[PDB]
Amino acid sequence: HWGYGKHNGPEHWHKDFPIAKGERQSPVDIDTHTAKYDPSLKPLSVSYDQATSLRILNNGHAFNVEFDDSQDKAVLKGGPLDGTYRLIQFHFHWGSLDGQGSEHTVDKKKYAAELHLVHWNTKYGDFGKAVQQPDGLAVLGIFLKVGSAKPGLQKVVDVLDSIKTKGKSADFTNFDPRGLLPESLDYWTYPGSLTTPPLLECVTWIVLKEPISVSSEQVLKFRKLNFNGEGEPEELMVDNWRPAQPLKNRQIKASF
Ligand SMILES: NS(=O)(=O)c1ccc(S(=O)(=O)NCc2cccs2)s1
Ligand SMILES: [Hg+2]
Ligand SMILES: [Zn+2]
């Protein structure tokens, strides 16, 4: 079924998921000169103080680090949001070369990878009811550029050998997601969708202005991962990013 190759990659997704062609799809190009600075946007409140990670899993499209979301332990509030959104997981999208890999672009510039911290609106009781709502999800997106090592990222990089193929998981407790944040929390925000099937239009995107840098050896490890399951022919998990979609009647507000 879907994936990222020539035969099953994003330009075919519309045949099984018609909403691919919809009105509020992500990612988009952020044109900085056309973004509306909006001084009513409150500051973001990221409270990742009591976050509990549980495991890391290769799901055949990316690796995800899952968090215990049965209590308000790691939450996002403020900014463009109303209500509290709980952290349930984070994943990355990366490229086969350092000059591509982000999903969102800034003035058409692509970064090496993009981190998504996925949150769901607690108003709706669980993630499953939240993906049935226009304001059910908030994804915090962070660009990664190649440069110095991000020390807080190393823990994730060392375990990737344990989960090389589709379906494997490892326990991954006590990981603190605060080590992945930039100094500045300035952002752009617009309404969009998930960037992989089912491509539901449930998401308030918050894309941070400031990138974090990781070294080439760190993003290099991402590329050694596999799309295939164990014992199937190896396909390297590289280029698992969707192309920018038409913004069509949406405006990107900027907090700066
Ligand atoms: N790239 S992204 O951040 O926009 C995401 C892609 C998929 C995401 S999900 O795993 O949280 N939901 C996928 C679903 C699972 C069950 C019902 S929909 S978040
Ligand atoms: Hg929705
Ligand atoms: Zn994503």
UniProtKB/Swiss-Prot annotation:
Substrate binds at residues 195-196. CDD domains: alpha_CA_I_II_III_XIII (cd03119). Residues 1-256 form the Alpha-carbonic anhydrase domain. The record marks 89 as: Involved in the binding of some activators, including histamine and L-histidine. The record marks 4, 59, 64 as: Fine-tunes the proton-transfer properties of H-64. Changing residue 139 to H: Impaired activity. Changing residue 103 to D: Normal CO(2) hydrase activity. Its cofactor is Zn(2+); Co(2+). It comes from the Eukaryota. It is an enzyme of class 4 (lyase). Changing residue 59 to H: Reduced proton transfer. Interacts with SLC4A4. Interaction with SLC4A7 regulates SLC4A7 transporter activity. Interacts with SLC26A6 isoform 4 (via C-terminus cytoplasmic domain). This is Carbonic anhydrase 2. It comes from Homo sapiens (Human). The gene is CA2.
